[PDB]
Amino acid sequence: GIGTGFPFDPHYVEVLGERMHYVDVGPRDGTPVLFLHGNPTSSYVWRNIIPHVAPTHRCIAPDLIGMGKSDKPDLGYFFDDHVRFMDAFIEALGLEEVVLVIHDWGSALGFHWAKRNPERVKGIAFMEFIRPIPTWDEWPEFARETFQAFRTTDVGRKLIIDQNVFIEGTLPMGVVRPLTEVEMDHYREPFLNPVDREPLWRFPNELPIAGEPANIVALVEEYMDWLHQSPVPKLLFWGTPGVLIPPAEAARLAKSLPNCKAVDIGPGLNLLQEDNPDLIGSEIARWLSTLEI
Ligand SMILES: CN(C)c1ccc2c(-c3cc(C(=O)NCCOCCOCCCCCNS(C)(=O)=O)ccc3C(=O)O)c3ccc(=[N+](C)C)cc-3oc2c1
């Protein structure tokens, strides 16, 4: 079955006075492949993808500040905080050119970094990514009242911070197949202490939905503008019914984005890596062999 283990040796780097944890496997030479997770996951979400790529390419998978095994400073964990730390992480490792593999809030980080540094990105593989959502009618109906509630400082903090609903409920509701107890405990581990759950609540409050928050809407529209023009090689994975990306949106993008291959993973919601890791990893490995890296 789908692997539940996390076999990777820990690596740490000090970034803006904080320790960040990252996976680092594969050959030392060549262009590295940088894997960026989102909310409410960690490098754990890549555990079954990376072994398809690590035979032939360096694989780097950081834990975002405040998540996974990375340090947990007392921040608001706005997107801007994550931008600052990830910019600094990339420079701290001395990375030059990279290929991005990104998901969920990792995709906003990766696309925003790529748009600002396009000479350094040799391809982007992405799935269930952050786009401006025009209206709440575009959010899945089965999750709509809850995500509206999440975006409040009263009910939303009760649910996410006090009661850990984003880990105990929203996360499994983002995977078609059932998560095992071992997998749930891996996703629970960074957040056993409620005071450490700020990123879990700030992230859905940063989602650009119906024009709010206006600043994130503008930032995400900017990198989407770039994505519609840039020749950067693109690999888009999508599933049915999806969450952030419905199938009809993936089909539009597969035609409108230049140099874009789109891959149907079958049933999927948000954590597509948990529903079809074999296809995602094997398609990434094949696609990499076609890039000038
Ligand atoms: C401890 N106590 C107070 C609760 C409270 C509520 C629940 C709930 C629950 C979830 C929800 C709920 O989370 N609805 C929302 C689902 O949305 C799914 C689609 O988006 C996946 C996105 C993934 C992350 C994207 N990240 S990003 C870009 O946003 O940063 C609503 C009501 C309930 C309910 O039951 O009352 C559980 C639901 C399922 C479950 N099982 C399958 C084991 C366990 C649940 O346990 C719960 C425990």
Numbering used by the authors: 3 to 295
Task: Give the text the authors published on this PDB structure.
Taking advantage of the crystal structure of HaloTag7 labeled with tetramethylrhodamine (TMR), we used computational screening to identify tentative xHTLs. In brief, putative xHTLs were designed by varying the terminal alkane chain length (C4–C7) as well as by replacing the chlorine atom with other functional groups. TMR-linked PEG2-C5-methylsulfonamide (S5) was one of the compounds that presented a lower ΔGbind compared to regular TMR-CA (ΔΔGbind = −4.2 kcal/mol), which displays a KD < 1 μM.6 We synthesized S5 as well as a fluorinated triflamide derivative T5 in order to improve cell permeability and coupled both to fluorogenic rhodamine dyes−34 such as SiR35. The binding mode of TMR-S5 and TMR-T5 to HaloTag7 was further studied through X-ray crystallography. While the S5 moiety occupies a similar position in both the docking experiment and the crystal structure (rmsd = 1.0 ± 0.3 Å on five atoms), the TMR shows a different position on the HaloTag7 surface in the docking experiment. The alkane-PEG chain occupies the same hydrophobic channel but presents a different conformation. The L209/I211 conformational change induced by the TMR-T5 binding in the HaloTag7 active site allows a more favorable orientation of the sulfonamide group to form hydrogen bonds with active side residues than observed for TMR-S5; while the TMR-S5 nitrogen-sulfonamide forms a 3.3 Å hydrogen bond with the catalytic D106 carboxylic acid moiety, the corresponding hydrogen bond in bound TMR-T5 is only 2.7 Å. This difference in binding interactions might contribute to the higher affinity of T5-based probes than those of S5-based probes. In contrast, SiR- S5 showed only a 2-fold fluorescence increase upon HaloTag7 binding.
